[PDB]
Amino acid sequence: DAKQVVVGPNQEDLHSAEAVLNRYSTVGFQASNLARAFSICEMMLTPQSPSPSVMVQPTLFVGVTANLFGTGCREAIRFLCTECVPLPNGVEPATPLDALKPSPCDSRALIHVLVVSGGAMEHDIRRACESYKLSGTDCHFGNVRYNSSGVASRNLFSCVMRCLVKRLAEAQRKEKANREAAPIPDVCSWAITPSTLWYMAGLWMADIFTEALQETGEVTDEKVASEEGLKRAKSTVLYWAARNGVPIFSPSLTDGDIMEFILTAGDTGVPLLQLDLVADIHRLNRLAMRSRRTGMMILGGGVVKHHVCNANLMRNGADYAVFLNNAQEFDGSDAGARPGEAVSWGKLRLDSTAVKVYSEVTIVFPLIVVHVFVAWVRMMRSKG
Amino acid sequence: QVVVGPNQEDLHSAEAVLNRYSTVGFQASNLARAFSICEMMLTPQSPSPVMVQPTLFVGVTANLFGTGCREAIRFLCTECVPLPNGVEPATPSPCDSRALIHVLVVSGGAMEHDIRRACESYKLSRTDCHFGNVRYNSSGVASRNLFSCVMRCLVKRLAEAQRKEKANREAYYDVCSWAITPSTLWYMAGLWMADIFTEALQETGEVTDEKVASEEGLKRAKSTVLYWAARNGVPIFSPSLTDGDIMEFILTAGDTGVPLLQLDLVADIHRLNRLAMRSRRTGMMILGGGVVKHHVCNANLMRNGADYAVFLNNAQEFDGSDAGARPGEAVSWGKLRLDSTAVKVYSEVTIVFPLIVVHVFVAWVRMMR
Amino acid sequence: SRVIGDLDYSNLLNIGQEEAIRCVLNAYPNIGLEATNLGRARRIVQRALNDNGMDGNKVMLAYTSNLISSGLRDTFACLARENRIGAVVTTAGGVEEDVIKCLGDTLVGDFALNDHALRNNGLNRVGNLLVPNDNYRNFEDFFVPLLRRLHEQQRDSRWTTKTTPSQIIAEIGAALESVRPNDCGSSLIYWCYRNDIPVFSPAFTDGSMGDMIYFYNYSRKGLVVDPVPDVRRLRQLGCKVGRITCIVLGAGLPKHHLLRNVQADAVVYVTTGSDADGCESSCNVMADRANGLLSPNCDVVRVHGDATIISPLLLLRS
Amino acid sequence: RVIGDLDYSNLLNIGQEEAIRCVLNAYPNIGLEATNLGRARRIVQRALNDNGMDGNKVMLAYTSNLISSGLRDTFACLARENRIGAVVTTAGGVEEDVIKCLGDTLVGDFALNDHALRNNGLNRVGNLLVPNDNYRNFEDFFVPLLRRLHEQQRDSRWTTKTTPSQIIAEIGAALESVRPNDCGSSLIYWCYRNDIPVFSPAFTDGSMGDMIYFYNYSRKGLVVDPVPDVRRLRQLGCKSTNVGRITCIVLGAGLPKHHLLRNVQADAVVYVTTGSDADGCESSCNVMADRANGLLSPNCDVVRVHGDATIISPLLLLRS
Ligand SMILES: NC(=O)c1ccc[n+]([C@@H]2O[C@H](COP(=O)([O-])OP(=O)(O)OC[C@H]3O[C@@H](n4cnc5c(N)ncnc54)[C@H](O)[C@@H]3O)[C@@H](O)[C@H]2O)c1
Ligand SMILES: NC(=O)c1ccc[n+]([C@@H]2O[C@H](COP(=O)([O-])OP(=O)(O)OC[C@H]3O[C@@H](n4cnc5c(N)ncnc54)[C@H](O)[C@@H]3O)[C@@H](O)[C@H]2O)c1
Ligand SMILES: NC(=O)c1ccc[n+]([C@@H]2O[C@H](COP(=O)([O-])OP(=O)(O)OC[C@H]3O[C@@H](n4cnc5c(N)ncnc54)[C@H](O)[C@@H]3O)[C@@H](O)[C@H]2O)c1
Ligand SMILES: NC(=O)c1ccc[n+]([C@@H]2O[C@H](COP(=O)([O-])OP(=O)(O)OC[C@H]3O[C@@H](n4cnc5c(N)ncnc54)[C@H](O)[C@@H]3O)[C@@H](O)[C@H]2O)c1
Ligand code: NA
């Protein structure tokens, strides 16, 4: 029975944000939960021993709900996928390493795998084609507004995410034709899975922007439509997700703005795209099962919160977890569930350490990344 | 037990549905436990570790008197069942409560809503004031409206009665007797509710006949919780009275020369904490949170805890408040006993409170009658 | 109407107890606040479940996964058994634990139960409910063979007939009738198969079914779950004499998938999320109208509270 | 009025202190409830600087549980520097501020067994702990002051020190006399020295009411009158002067919020609440519903940030 005293921001530490956030531990209530969230995240980035059943860099399962790509969290998630600090001396990747090119699972960045809900990566793409305004009919997802034009409109966004659908449809047709001419073995190889769809999307974002910028007529010169397209395509997390190789899983992709373009592209006569969900969970649940220490940081709740902890369920529990939603427990949902409800199933392990910060994401997640994540790559880079 | 919900057969009667809430998960089981704990508050039994009937402390949020809960709380103050021959009750504002509930702790602005609903009608959505999808009209402080006249007669009656006792008395027998305490204020308001309405109905001009105004005044007065609370004798405590609509009249009634009224809070905390200290078996039903919840729990703290508790609110635990606190947080202070049974129903009051009154309280007074 | 009423509760002492509870539930539209929303929702749900039968209109149900872990699963089964529902939209757990509770029982517990002891005793917690691991061991005996059949059926057809969750869930209920002919009568999926009610689950692999697929694929690769034709399907069922009522108990993937692809004339919300989250589950009436989920002329009422208390009061028959 | 795009990688070369500020400065353009925090920060910071003593006033309304947390030390800095003009809080907001000079509040956990906490003499406040010995010492400090106040009210015709304002002001004076060392860390003490009126109309709802109940069981006399505090709080919230920029900082919405904004005419208001509009209460801060009831003027600048004030208030009060 050791107990700390309750002390909040002093006279001498209201002049530096570093000491305010440091003293969040001894303030109370839910700022202490955020103080743990700072620490558990720092553990997730620390090279540790294998799972308590040879040091490893834990594999980080990050989970993001869709609407958060509309707000500034898209900027912070992009940082997690952009910066690549190399592994030190005597540390292996926690997961020992194993047309429609599938998703590579070798993540050279801070996070290692990214699960999102349907309509998430759509918000990312439409935030380089437009600019979100705060409080062609305008849509609302809370404090923020954006413009949602027609599916076959001349909006820059509508052009980008039809050339994307057309590129996917023609690539799926090529793979189907090649396996039609070959003898039957046996997997359905022409079916694209959400991980590949977002991976090949991030690969194509550059050329698709350069093409859509011309088809909409915003810029008439190719050499500076090619340059502006790459500059717009370097703002999306899809680009850095494909470049550094963090797979974007999404079992709820079927419920996104993409489907507005998938269906309308099928109303011309050609069949719809063929998705496969068994390939995503196989890659996801094997990325988790094969690992030796796993971190978990989910933003919000829903399909995304349950999918990453289910992936770690194949592993008899995850080692670290930080849950950042404003859901409540009385409804007994997999969004408002406590971290304890996870360890009863075995999604979170018994020899663990986790915390739930009962507050909205936009307040806490920008503080999380700027206090440890940017600071932890500044440590690994400046010192040397 | 097994999880089973409303079946094919038992979707045709609301009794079986509300009975099967026990085997349905989540907050229906908490509401079914709230059903049982309320019946335990109504069952005559032995005192805490010579049978007694528990004294029930019910605390109500202010705005909840704007909604239909005013109707149900009025029922809790109206109907009364004689205690069986072999059970004893656990023993200016009187404490002799012959009714279902025995103490009423309400927030500031509650009884002002109780008064205002017999003067006009509260409208719903799909200058006028808002509290959710309900809308009411609070007219000017010195207006000709019926509510303003009733509240002015009340304040004027209280000021004149305070001066008389002041002039009357102008160590252990040296108390500030001219100070009026919230429990006495709402008590006297319930006594005067008949005559105050009859006088205001004339001063407004809606009915100039003395006979019809006398009959209509009693009809509007009988609808308020204040009337039956004073008639059957449940004290209406409110330390937050200083923050209600009534202060708009008490303050400007002092802007015409006469001093403001003189409140007293020590008399209220003494009567409240003594009704709980000298109690032998106590129940607790809190609608909402805030001042009303802590005041009832703190009253039972003087009795090293309460026996039964039912919290109907929609507050959360992460903010570390005394409104969103778990029932457990009560026993740590000693406000709730260890040998206790309690439950919190996480839901809006207006959904769960009518069910509770109709399912156990209405049924219990019919079983005993 | 449009005014708060006054109910003489003492007048209920003489009337029957059953009629007394109904007399108060009937005065809910004018009691106040989020009970008025319950009363308005009940009138929409009741008149929909009665009219929307076989006269040209439709009722579509959207429920979350935890609501069938509770007892509401049996209440929903009554709705599909009577062919009152036109279409069902659950996440993924609304199909699993509905079939599970034919192979075992869910138990009531408490939120306070120690989760470390529950793990060591093989007890999975769903809020204040418990699902023993033996239930999922039996589901592995039931579902793994069904995937073995579907894998052959897809391969013989080259992935053209049984690719979508709609056909899979429909044959899940058919397999439940064949394997377990006694307990199938209490399953929602069974009646959705027999009475021909399509069930939609675009995030199908998020749950125990995905884990069963994960075990099966790890030995025999080839199965495919294609959920994009279910969108063309669900839209074709919502494209409008033509009165389309949508009952959304709990929000999430149930709510969006239904109201985005179906144009409803009447919608009922029973949610708990708050607008501050800035998400879909925070059922904002005007904001959902701004995004095309609701038409501006659509009759809609939103109840804030746990659907476990609301749904029985809305579905209670007249 | 537009969501920004911040290059987080650009923070790697700038200093760490400025980096954390580069994001907190960008909070108005992040989105959702960080924008409302950034807007609230701009209002609070400008009010805490400009409205020191130039015909302007800043009034703070906090709930009782937030001085159980560490925010009481932060609040003390505000009244210590005479930046606050008036304080509104429920009884506990006064109690535990004086308590934490007579003892320490500890950090615990929401999961702690409350039955064991009782058997171990520990009072739980969310995830905080207040030992019973703290209140045993508070009884030694407060029940003499009650006897002093009774003699003071009795021989003065019950009309010299009857309101909570004068009582709380003399609580800071008594805390200066009895405990001269620890009094510097209490909000009530600086409110006495800097002459900042503290208002608590629900005074007997808390430990102070228990101390009064124990004292009034033998010496029946001591009384309290909170209705003159309404005239007092209205007197301080009167901008007929037309050169008043009067800001109200409401951290946590309970009785403080209503009692302050109802009697004080604020030109700028900041809400830091958690309740939801579905409750239909005077805590679920509804901006337009408060305007309809006269709590917010139609020309008043107001922002509402949704979250635990334990996380919000430090970022709002963080001096730049
Ligand atoms: N582009 C679109 O049209 C769009 C947008 C959003 C969601 N959806 C669909 O709705 C389905 C479920 O919606 P969802 O996954 O986005 O969330 P959700 O509606 O299912 O709610 C998830 C829970 O996480 C919490 N939460 C959500 N957002 C939060 C936030 N910003 N801050 C703090 N807590 C938060 C809340 O407690 C919430 O109840 C998805 O499968 C998706 O397909 C579509
Ligand atoms: N809960 C399970 O047992 C279970 C089982 C298998 C799979 N899953 C998976 O977990 C994911 C999330 O499940 P979900 O569909 O429940 O979404 P969810 O749990 O994230 O829904 C959260 C939101 O829905 C509303 N809500 C939740 N519970 C409610 C209630 N009892 N009454 C009223 N409203 C309520 C609230 O607005 C809440 O904010 C799904 O993708 C699903 O595939 C869950
Ligand atoms: N007529 C008036 O002038 C008037 C009216 C209402 C309140 N007030 C003032 O506002 C102050 C605070 O109001 P309060 O005492 O009611 O507490 P509150 O409004 O600050 O909130 C109390 C808590 O109880 C819960 N709650 C409140 N109303 C609920 C409901 N209808 N259903 C379910 N849960 C509910 C909420 O979770 C809330 O957190 C009061 O002390 C009073 O002075 C004045
Ligand atoms: N548990 C305690 O902290 C404590 C201690 C001593 C006395 N009391 C007494 O309990 C009574 C009620 O307490 P209160 O009026 O001071 O507040 P409260 O406990 O009544 O809180 C009610 C409302 O204040 C808001 N709120 C509460 N905590 C919050 C937080 N951490 N962040 C943001 N918003 C928050 C919420 O909207 C909530 O609905 C008071 O009269 C007080 O005397 C409480
Ligand atoms: Na949206």
mmCIF file of N, CA and C and ligand atoms in Angstrom, chain A residues 301-304 306-307 310 327 330-336 341 345, chain B residues 26, chain C residues 63-67 69 90-94 96-97 126 136 203-208 249-254 270-274 277 279 281-283 305-308, ligand 2:
data_model
loop_
_atom_site.group_PDB
_atom_site.id
_atom_site.type_symbol
_atom_site.label_atom_id
_atom_site.label_comp_id
_atom_site.label_asym_id
_atom_site.label_seq_id
_atom_site.Cartn_x
_atom_site.Cartn_y
_atom_site.Cartn_z
ATOM 1 N N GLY A 301 -14.172 3.663 -30.744
ATOM 2 C CA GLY A 301 -14.626 2.301 -30.550
ATOM 3 C C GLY A 301 -15.324 1.764 -31.780
ATOM 4 N N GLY A 302 -16.013 0.636 -31.640
ATOM 5 C CA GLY A 302 -16.757 0.082 -32.750
ATOM 6 C C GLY A 302 -16.106 -1.124 -33.388
ATOM 7 N N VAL A 303 -16.252 -1.240 -34.709
ATOM 8 C CA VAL A 303 -15.637 -2.341 -35.444
ATOM 9 C C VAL A 303 -14.131 -2.345 -35.234
ATOM 10 N N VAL A 304 -13.532 -1.156 -35.143
ATOM 11 C CA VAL A 304 -12.078 -1.055 -35.124
ATOM 12 C C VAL A 304 -11.519 -1.514 -33.782
ATOM 13 N N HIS A 306 -12.853 -3.702 -31.662
ATOM 14 C CA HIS A 306 -13.006 -5.141 -31.492
ATOM 15 C C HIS A 306 -12.124 -5.932 -32.448
ATOM 16 N N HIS A 307 -11.767 -5.356 -33.597
ATOM 17 C CA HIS A 307 -11.040 -6.129 -34.599
ATOM 18 C C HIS A 307 -9.578 -6.320 -34.211
ATOM 19 N N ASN A 310 -9.453 -8.699 -31.167
ATOM 20 C CA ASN A 310 -9.708 -10.048 -31.658
ATOM 21 C C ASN A 310 -8.478 -10.614 -32.357
ATOM 22 N N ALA A 327 -16.912 6.368 -24.642
ATOM 23 C CA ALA A 327 -18.032 5.456 -24.491
ATOM 24 C C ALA A 327 -18.207 5.070 -23.029
ATOM 25 N N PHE A 330 -22.449 1.134 -19.324
ATOM 26 C CA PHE A 330 -23.743 0.606 -18.897
ATOM 27 C C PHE A 330 -24.485 -0.098 -20.027
ATOM 28 N N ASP A 331 -24.206 0.260 -21.280
ATOM 29 C CA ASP A 331 -24.880 -0.387 -22.398
ATOM 30 C C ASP A 331 -24.280 -1.743 -22.744
ATOM 31 N N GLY A 332 -23.143 -2.099 -22.148
ATOM 32 C CA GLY A 332 -22.537 -3.400 -22.356
ATOM 33 C C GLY A 332 -22.131 -3.663 -23.791
ATOM 34 N N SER A 333 -21.500 -2.682 -24.426
ATOM 35 C CA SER A 333 -21.081 -2.784 -25.814
ATOM 36 C C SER A 333 -19.573 -2.975 -25.902
ATOM 37 N N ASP A 334 -19.129 -3.506 -27.042
ATOM 38 C CA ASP A 334 -17.700 -3.671 -27.289
ATOM 39 C C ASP A 334 -16.996 -2.348 -27.562
ATOM 40 N N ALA A 335 -17.710 -1.224 -27.495
ATOM 41 C CA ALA A 335 -17.108 0.102 -27.523
ATOM 42 C C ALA A 335 -16.901 0.660 -26.120
ATOM 43 N N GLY A 336 -17.932 0.595 -25.279
ATOM 44 C CA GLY A 336 -17.866 1.042 -23.907
ATOM 45 C C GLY A 336 -17.325 0.036 -22.922
ATOM 46 N N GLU A 341 -12.999 -6.137 -19.455
ATOM 47 C CA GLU A 341 -13.815 -6.991 -20.311
ATOM 48 C C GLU A 341 -12.993 -7.618 -21.431
ATOM 49 N N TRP A 345 -12.056 -12.306 -22.038
ATOM 50 C CA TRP A 345 -12.027 -13.115 -23.251
ATOM 51 C C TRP A 345 -10.649 -13.703 -23.505
ATOM 52 N N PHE B 26 -27.879 -6.205 -19.195
ATOM 53 C CA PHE B 26 -27.557 -4.782 -19.208
ATOM 54 C C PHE B 26 -28.408 -4.042 -18.180
ATOM 55 N N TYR C 63 -30.112 -3.775 -35.440
ATOM 56 C CA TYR C 63 -29.775 -3.976 -34.040
ATOM 57 C C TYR C 63 -28.286 -4.249 -33.900
ATOM 58 N N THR C 64 -27.742 -3.880 -32.746
ATOM 59 C CA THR C 64 -26.330 -4.079 -32.466
ATOM 60 C C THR C 64 -26.092 -5.471 -31.877
ATOM 61 N N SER C 65 -24.814 -5.839 -31.765
ATOM 62 C CA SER C 65 -24.467 -7.211 -31.405
ATOM 63 C C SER C 65 -24.801 -7.521 -29.949
ATOM 64 N N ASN C 66 -24.615 -6.552 -29.048
ATOM 65 C CA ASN C 66 -24.829 -6.813 -27.628
ATOM 66 C C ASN C 66 -26.300 -7.013 -27.285
ATOM 67 N N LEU C 67 -27.213 -6.495 -28.109
ATOM 68 C CA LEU C 67 -28.634 -6.589 -27.800
ATOM 69 C C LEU C 67 -29.171 -8.008 -27.931
ATOM 70 N N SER C 69 -27.032 -10.609 -27.288
ATOM 71 C CA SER C 69 -26.435 -11.215 -26.106
ATOM 72 C C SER C 69 -27.368 -11.079 -24.915
ATOM 73 N N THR C 90 -27.466 -6.425 -38.932
ATOM 74 C CA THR C 90 -26.628 -6.508 -37.741
ATOM 75 C C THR C 90 -25.161 -6.366 -38.138
ATOM 76 N N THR C 91 -24.312 -6.126 -37.135
ATOM 77 C CA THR C 91 -22.869 -6.022 -37.329
ATOM 78 C C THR C 91 -22.277 -7.362 -37.746
ATOM 79 N N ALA C 92 -22.126 -8.277 -36.787
ATOM 80 C CA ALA C 92 -21.558 -9.596 -37.050
ATOM 81 C C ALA C 92 -21.850 -10.510 -35.870
ATOM 82 N N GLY C 93 -21.835 -9.937 -34.666
ATOM 83 C CA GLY C 93 -22.242 -10.637 -33.473
ATOM 84 C C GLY C 93 -23.729 -10.900 -33.360
ATOM 85 N N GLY C 94 -24.559 -10.239 -34.176
ATOM 86 C CA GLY C 94 -25.987 -10.502 -34.156
ATOM 87 C C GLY C 94 -26.389 -11.792 -34.831
ATOM 88 N N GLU C 96 -23.873 -14.534 -34.885
ATOM 89 C CA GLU C 96 -23.131 -15.510 -34.097
ATOM 90 C C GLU C 96 -23.908 -15.939 -32.860
ATOM 91 N N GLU C 97 -24.012 -15.049 -31.871
ATOM 92 C CA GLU C 97 -24.624 -15.410 -30.598
ATOM 93 C C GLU C 97 -26.101 -15.761 -30.723
ATOM 94 N N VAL C 126 -19.788 -10.155 -21.304
ATOM 95 C CA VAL C 126 -20.420 -9.190 -22.205
ATOM 96 C C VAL C 126 -21.187 -8.211 -21.322
ATOM 97 N N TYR C 136 -18.684 -21.602 -27.476
ATOM 98 C CA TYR C 136 -17.925 -21.398 -28.705
ATOM 99 C C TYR C 136 -17.241 -22.675 -29.174
ATOM 100 N N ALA C 203 -19.511 -6.172 -42.249
ATOM 101 C CA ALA C 203 -18.307 -6.516 -41.494
ATOM 102 C C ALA C 203 -18.532 -7.894 -40.884
ATOM 103 N N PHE C 204 -18.391 -8.914 -41.731
ATOM 104 C CA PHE C 204 -18.771 -10.271 -41.355
ATOM 105 C C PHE C 204 -17.692 -10.972 -40.540
ATOM 106 N N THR C 205 -16.423 -10.734 -40.857
ATOM 107 C CA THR C 205 -15.327 -11.440 -40.204
ATOM 108 C C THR C 205 -14.953 -10.855 -38.850
ATOM 109 N N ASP C 206 -15.611 -9.783 -38.410
ATOM 110 C CA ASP C 206 -15.318 -9.172 -37.113
ATOM 111 C C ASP C 206 -16.139 -9.893 -36.052
ATOM 112 N N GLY C 207 -15.574 -10.953 -35.497
ATOM 113 C CA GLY C 207 -16.228 -11.702 -34.448
ATOM 114 C C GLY C 207 -15.760 -13.144 -34.453
ATOM 115 N N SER C 208 -16.526 -13.983 -33.750
ATOM 116 C CA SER C 208 -16.177 -15.395 -33.641
ATOM 117 C C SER C 208 -16.225 -16.095 -34.992
ATOM 118 N N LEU C 249 -32.289 -0.142 -33.288
ATOM 119 C CA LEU C 249 -32.007 -0.312 -31.866
ATOM 120 C C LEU C 249 -30.495 -0.396 -31.696
ATOM 121 N N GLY C 250 -29.902 0.659 -31.148
ATOM 122 C CA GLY C 250 -28.457 0.734 -31.059
ATOM 123 C C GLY C 250 -27.833 1.102 -32.389
ATOM 124 N N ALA C 251 -26.859 2.004 -32.370
ATOM 125 C CA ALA C 251 -26.242 2.511 -33.586
ATOM 126 C C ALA C 251 -24.846 1.925 -33.774
ATOM 127 N N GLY C 252 -24.274 2.202 -34.944
ATOM 128 C CA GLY C 252 -22.994 1.647 -35.338
ATOM 129 C C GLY C 252 -22.984 1.307 -36.812
ATOM 130 N N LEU C 253 -22.590 0.086 -37.149
ATOM 131 C CA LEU C 253 -22.735 -0.384 -38.519
ATOM 132 C C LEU C 253 -24.186 -0.739 -38.848
ATOM 133 N N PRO C 254 -25.003 -1.202 -37.888
ATOM 134 C CA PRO C 254 -26.441 -1.332 -38.185
ATOM 135 C C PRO C 254 -27.083 -0.055 -38.706
ATOM 136 N N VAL C 270 -32.773 4.461 -31.096
ATOM 137 C CA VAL C 270 -32.629 4.099 -29.685
ATOM 138 C C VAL C 270 -31.130 3.946 -29.442
ATOM 139 N N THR C 271 -30.480 5.031 -29.027
ATOM 140 C CA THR C 271 -29.031 5.087 -28.912
ATOM 141 C C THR C 271 -28.642 5.632 -27.542
ATOM 142 N N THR C 272 -27.332 5.650 -27.282
ATOM 143 C CA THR C 272 -26.784 6.234 -26.065
ATOM 144 C C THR C 272 -25.632 7.200 -26.310
ATOM 145 N N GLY C 273 -25.059 7.232 -27.512
ATOM 146 C CA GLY C 273 -23.925 8.095 -27.765
ATOM 147 C C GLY C 273 -24.290 9.566 -27.718
ATOM 148 N N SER C 274 -23.281 10.386 -27.439
ATOM 149 C CA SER C 274 -23.439 11.826 -27.320
ATOM 150 C C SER C 274 -22.844 12.526 -28.535
ATOM 151 N N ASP C 277 -19.019 13.153 -29.488
ATOM 152 C CA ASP C 277 -18.137 12.185 -30.129
ATOM 153 C C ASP C 277 -17.923 12.487 -31.606
ATOM 154 N N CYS C 279 -19.511 11.246 -34.173
ATOM 155 C CA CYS C 279 -19.548 9.979 -34.885
ATOM 156 C C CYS C 279 -20.983 9.659 -35.282
ATOM 157 N N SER C 281 -22.739 6.952 -34.409
ATOM 158 C CA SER C 281 -23.529 6.363 -33.332
ATOM 159 C C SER C 281 -24.262 7.425 -32.524
ATOM 160 N N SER C 282 -23.720 8.641 -32.469
ATOM 161 C CA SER C 282 -24.395 9.771 -31.834
ATOM 162 C C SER C 282 -25.491 10.256 -32.778
ATOM 163 N N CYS C 283 -26.623 9.553 -32.730
ATOM 164 C CA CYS C 283 -27.734 9.800 -33.639
ATOM 165 C C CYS C 283 -28.225 11.238 -33.545
ATOM 166 N N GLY C 305 -31.261 6.245 -24.494
ATOM 167 C CA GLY C 305 -31.274 5.305 -23.393
ATOM 168 C C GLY C 305 -30.855 3.933 -23.860
ATOM 169 N N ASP C 306 -30.737 3.030 -22.891
ATOM 170 C CA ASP C 306 -30.347 1.655 -23.173
ATOM 171 C C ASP C 306 -31.517 0.926 -23.822
ATOM 172 N N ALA C 307 -31.302 0.429 -25.045
ATOM 173 C CA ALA C 307 -32.364 -0.241 -25.790
ATOM 174 C C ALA C 307 -32.936 -1.436 -25.045
ATOM 175 N N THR C 308 -32.200 -1.977 -24.071
ATOM 176 C CA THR C 308 -32.716 -3.084 -23.277
ATOM 177 C C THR C 308 -33.970 -2.685 -22.507
HETATM 178 N N1 LIG E 2 -20.729 -7.236 -28.557
HETATM 179 C C1 LIG E 2 -20.404 -8.597 -28.977
HETATM 180 O O1 LIG E 2 -20.670 -9.486 -28.250
HETATM 181 C C2 LIG E 2 -19.736 -8.877 -30.329
HETATM 182 C C3 LIG E 2 -19.664 -10.151 -30.797
HETATM 183 C C4 LIG E 2 -19.068 -10.408 -32.000
HETATM 184 C C5 LIG E 2 -18.532 -9.370 -32.755
HETATM 185 N N2 LIG E 2 -18.599 -8.109 -32.306
HETATM 186 C C6 LIG E 2 -18.036 -7.058 -33.082
HETATM 187 O O2 LIG E 2 -17.715 -5.868 -32.210
HETATM 188 C C7 LIG E 2 -17.952 -4.692 -33.143
HETATM 189 C C8 LIG E 2 -18.728 -3.647 -32.388
HETATM 190 O O3 LIG E 2 -20.029 -4.196 -32.073
HETATM 191 P P1 LIG E 2 -21.381 -3.187 -32.106
HETATM 192 O O4 LIG E 2 -22.264 -3.546 -33.266
HETATM 193 O O5 LIG E 2 -22.172 -3.380 -30.835
HETATM 194 O O6 LIG E 2 -20.899 -1.600 -32.213
HETATM 195 P P2 LIG E 2 -20.566 -0.643 -30.874
HETATM 196 O O7 LIG E 2 -20.469 -1.548 -29.672
HETATM 197 O O8 LIG E 2 -19.266 0.088 -31.053
HETATM 198 O O9 LIG E 2 -21.764 0.497 -30.612
HETATM 199 C C9 LIG E 2 -21.438 1.582 -29.750
HETATM 200 C C10 LIG E 2 -22.467 2.659 -29.924
HETATM 201 O O10 LIG E 2 -23.762 1.999 -30.271
HETATM 202 C C11 LIG E 2 -24.755 2.516 -29.272
HETATM 203 N N3 LIG E 2 -25.112 1.479 -28.330
HETATM 204 C C12 LIG E 2 -24.307 0.589 -27.933
HETATM 205 N N4 LIG E 2 -24.959 -0.210 -27.077
HETATM 206 C C13 LIG E 2 -26.252 0.251 -26.981
HETATM 207 C C14 LIG E 2 -27.384 -0.131 -26.279
HETATM 208 N N5 LIG E 2 -27.296 -1.296 -25.407
HETATM 209 N N6 LIG E 2 -28.489 0.558 -26.420
HETATM 210 C C15 LIG E 2 -28.524 1.614 -27.225
HETATM 211 N N7 LIG E 2 -27.473 2.027 -27.920
HETATM 212 C C16 LIG E 2 -26.327 1.383 -27.829
HETATM 213 C C17 LIG E 2 -24.111 3.648 -28.600
HETATM 214 O O11 LIG E 2 -24.387 4.900 -29.319
HETATM 215 C C18 LIG E 2 -22.673 3.368 -28.648
HETATM 216 O O12 LIG E 2 -21.947 4.623 -28.568
HETATM 217 C C19 LIG E 2 -18.740 -5.159 -34.300
HETATM 218 O O13 LIG E 2 -18.034 -4.921 -35.555
HETATM 219 C C20 LIG E 2 -18.961 -6.599 -34.134
HETATM 220 O O14 LIG E 2 -18.646 -7.275 -35.378
HETATM 221 C C21 LIG E 2 -19.187 -7.831 -31.102
#
